[PDB]
Amino acid sequence: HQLSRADVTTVSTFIDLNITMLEDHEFVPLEVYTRHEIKDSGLLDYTE
Amino acid sequence: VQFEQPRRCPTRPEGQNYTEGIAVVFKENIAPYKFKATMYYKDVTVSQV
């Protein structure tokens, strides 16, 4: 009789190697203090 | 001469364990304390003419 290849158990001669891509990353703007904060840290503003 | 027998392969390092959490990051406060005040004074002018 004939039979499908799926009827025969499969052994692999291939060596596996799983490489995955480094995914995209988004860098948002990020400051510890803005210019507004730096200017506001003064106690008196001469101009105002 | 003879062939070298299979070497012991490296292993994938176990990896880093990460604890999930929620963070609040605080910086040194440089903002002055602000509040409301009221001044009560009198402009006093003496003109010598």
Oligomer: part of a larger assembly
Order of helices and strands of chain A: H
End-to-end Cα distance of chain A, whole Å, is 98 Å
Largest sheet, strands/sense/barrel of chain A: none
The residue fraction in helices of chain A comes out at 10-25%
Q: Any idea what the radius of gyration of chain A is?
A: 33 Å
Q: What is the approximate shape of chain A? A: rod-shaped
Helix vs. strand class of chain A:
little secondary structure
Greatest interface: A-B, 7 and 4 residues
Query: Helix count of chain A?
Result: 1
Q: Which strand-content bin applies to the residues of chain A?
A: under 5%
Question: What do these coordinates show?
Answer:
It is classed as antiviral protein. The entry lists the keywords Neutralizing Antibody, antiviral protein. C6 Herpes Virus Simplex Neutralizing Nanobody Bound to HSV Glycoprotein gB. Chains A, B: Envelope glycoprotein B. This is part of a larger assembly, with 2 copies of chain A. Chain A is low in regular secondary structure and 48 residues long. Helices cover 12% and strands 0% of the residues of chain A. Chain A contains 1 helix and no strands. The longest helix of chain A is centred in the C-terminal third of the chain and has 6 residues, at 35-40. Chain A is rod-shaped, with a radius of gyration of 33 Å. The A-B interface holds A 32-33, 37-38, 40-41, 43 and B 27, 30-32.
